[PDB]
């Protein structure tokens, strides 16, 4: 259901963040881009900071995904948004 799909999206943000840290560990910086796979339920994006020392990963629900947590995000510090009531990963 929609809750399961939210958690699926969260899991994908996490493995995406893990890949970004592997890049960071080799290069000392985050990459200019990251290929992400969208679904009928979420659109995923990667936004590095201008200095490439930070990033924001987001999962934006489509109209087909009527979930009360809305857009989910995860940054380079592990901060998960919404901060409460939403994340289980």
Residue numbers in the entry: 1 to 89
Please share excerpts from the published article on this structure:
Type IV pili are found in many Gram-negative bacteria as well as in some Gram-positive bacteria and archaea, where they function in numerous cellular processes including adhesion, DNA transfer and virulence. Furthermore, in the metal reducing bacteria Shewanella oneidensis and Geobacter sulfurreducens type IV pili have been implicated in extracellular electron transport (EET) pathways. PilBac1ΔN consists of one long N-terminal α-helix packed against 4 antiparallel β-strands resembling the core fold of type IV pilins. Interestingly, our PilBac1 crystal structure reveals two unusual features compared to other type IVa pilins: an unusual position of the disulfide bridge and a straight α-helical section, which usually exhibits a pronounced kink.
The potential nanowire type IV pilin PilBac1 from S. oneidensis was characterized by a combination of complementary structural methods and the atomic structure was determined at a resolution of 1.67 Å by X-ray crystallography. To obtain a soluble version of PilBac1, a construct was designed that lacks the N-terminal 35 residues including the signal peptide and the transmembrane α-helix. A high resolution data set was collected on another crystal and data were processed in the high symmetry space group I222 to a resolution of 1.67 Å using the CC1/2 value as a cut-off. The model obtained from S-SAD was then used as a search model in molecular replacement for this data set, and all residues were modelled into clear electron density with no apparent ambiguities. The crystal form had a large solvent content (62%) yielding a high optical resolution and favorable data-to-parameter ratio at 1.67 Å resolution. PilBac1ΔN was crystallized as a parallel dimer in the asymmetric unit in which the interface is formed by interactions between 15 and 20 residues in the α-helix from monomers A and B, respectively (forming a non-proper dimer with a screw-axis) (R.M.S.D. of 0.309 Å based on 79 out of a total of 89 Cαs). A: Sodium ion binding site in chain B. The Na+ ion is coordinated by the backbone oxygens of Leu36 and Phe44, as well as the side chain oxygen of Asn38 and three water molecules. Interestingly, this sodium ion was not observed in chain A due to a slight distortion of the ion binding site compared to chain B. The backbone of Leu36 is further away from the binding site increasing the distance from 2.6 to 3.7 Å. Interestingly, PilBac1 possesses a helix breaking proline at position 22, but a helix breaking residue is missing at position 42. Therefore, kink 2 is missing in PilBac1 and the α-helix in the structure of PilBac1ΔN is straight.
